[PDB]
């Protein structure tokens, strides 16, 4: 048995419906299970006779003729971001055979982009640069300088304020390090705010 | 009882040492399964028990890996003379008559050449910029956890002693501190964003806590520096008018 999951990685703007596919070479499936991994959270379990299963905005189908299972996620939310795994049990066996997974990123809809790079000082001469409030079409590139550390973007959600924002952090011990140049390897918006000290 | 449990949640082992991983299935479940999962990949079946009988051992490596479930309840996966390639997440599942498999939280195993490679994080908190406050009336705190190995950490934020989740984002993946090399310590960042009025209250206390899972009493330690045992490393800040 070989379980093929496509796509390996998927980026989708929040609000869109999305499709995850899972195909298996051996169509003699006893049970099909979909999981979420942020251990494994069981999402849905489809029986040999069943052609579909649903749990909230998640709906999975099992096509007995084309050897496929499709997971549909309706009105995607940034909180749906996780790895999704498909697995099947073959008739006459007990073990699950898994696909390699789909790494899903649901990007927040930034209703008011205000890109900026702020300098933050240690609570205890150490500082970090914070690139924040950029739209989700902006990607943060890894550092090209080995002694400059740059994280990937992260989505935070101030849920009582209906406000989501992206950010990435850069830091270094180098003397010439300044927030004006920290994110030089990324495509940063032309209107990015670099405040005065 | 109602869920599958696994112990230890994290394990760092010296290459050549044996390890033992425990699984407690859901109370009374007949079937018990072990799986191995490599980073960014899918779980791979190892072995299956029906009560105490190991009916399908087909996924176990040809040497050093042996599972036990002598009373048909608790199962132990033993890995003899560990090698680097054994580093993985080991997952246990159990099922009853309906045959649906329920998974445990897993054991994250890291096999390293020597325990002197193990380091706790250093933790620091960076206070919000006054420019962010005037530009947005929001205030972002950043926490940095640096220089740790293995990547067995849990970072959390606490406001006046209460854990907070809203407005937080911790990097899903750590950064390599030695990116050109194969052997590297790690760094991790997190943000907590609050309203500016909340940050401006000097009575508000913010703490970033990192639980690092490291060595036990049983592990030997010969380096002059402090033994890198499981511990909490934290940093904090108070609000500012």
Residue numbers in the entry:
A (entry chain A): 2 to 32, 39 to 45, 49 to 62, 66 to 68, 74 to 142, 145 to 217
B (entry chain B): 1 to 31, 39 to 61, 66 to 81, 83 to 253
Lines quoted from the article behind this entry:
The CD1 family of MHC-class I-like molecules present an array of endogenous and foreign lipids Ags that are recognized by specialized T-cell populations. Here we describe a diverse population of CD1d–α-GalCer reactive cells that we termed ‘atypical NKT cells' because they lack the invariant TRAV10+TRAJ18+ α-chain and the TRBV25-1 β-chain that are inherent to type I NKT cells. Crystal structures of two of these atypical NKT TCRs in complex with CD1d–α-GalCer showed that, in contrast to type I NKT cell TCRs that dock over the F′-pocket of CD1d–α-GalCer, these atypical TCRs docked orthogonally over the A′-pocket of CD1d–α-GalCer. Thus, variations in the CD1d–α-GalCer-reactive NKT TCR repertoire can manifest in alternative docking strategies on CD1d and diverse reactivity towards CD1d-restricted lipids.
To confirm the non-canonical TRBV25-1− atypical NKT cell TCRs were indeed CD1d-restricted, we generated a panel of Jurkat T-cell lines transduced with TRBV25-1− TCRs and examined their ability to bind CD1d tetramers loaded with a range of lipid Ags. We selected four TRBV25-1− TCRs that represented a cross-section of the TCRα and TCRβ chain usage: clones 9C1 (TRAV21+TRAJ8+TRBV7–8+; Table 1, sequence #13); 9B1 (TRAV38-1+TRAJ48+TRBV9; Table 1, sequence #1); 9B2 (TRAV12-3+TRAJ27+TRBV6-5+; Table 1, sequence #2); 9B3 (TRAV13-2+TRAJ24+TRBV20-1+; Table 1, sequence #3) and two controls, namely a Jurkat pHLA-specific irrelevant TCR (TRAV17+TRBV16+) and an SKW3 TRAV10+TRAJ18+TRBV25-1+ type I NKT TCR+ cell line (SKW3.NKT15). Using surface plasmon resonance (SPR), we next determined the affinity of two atypical NKT TCRs from clones 9C1 and 9B2, towards CD1d bound to α-GalCer and variants thereof. These two TCRs were selected based on their contrasting Ag reactivity profiles, whereby the 9C1 TCR demonstrated a strong dependence on α-GalCer for activation, whereas the 9B2 TCR, whilst still reactive to CD1d–α-GalCer tetramers, demonstrated an auto-reactive profile that was associated with less Ag-specific activation. We also determined the structure of the 9C1 TCR in the non-liganded state, thereby allowing us to compare the mode, and plasticity of atypical NKT TCR recognition to that of typical type I TCR recognition of CD1d–α-GalCer. The 9C1 TCR did not undergo a major structural rearrangement on CD1d–α-GalCer engagement, although the CDR3 loops moved to bind the α-GalCer moiety. To enable this, the CDR3β residues (Ser108β, Arg109β, Asp110β and Leu111β) and Gln112α in the CDR3α rearranged to accommodate the Ag. Notably, the characteristics and conformation of the TRAJ8-encoded CDR3α loop of the 9C1 TCR contrasted that of the polar-rich TRAJ18-encoded CDR3α loop of the NKT15 TCR.
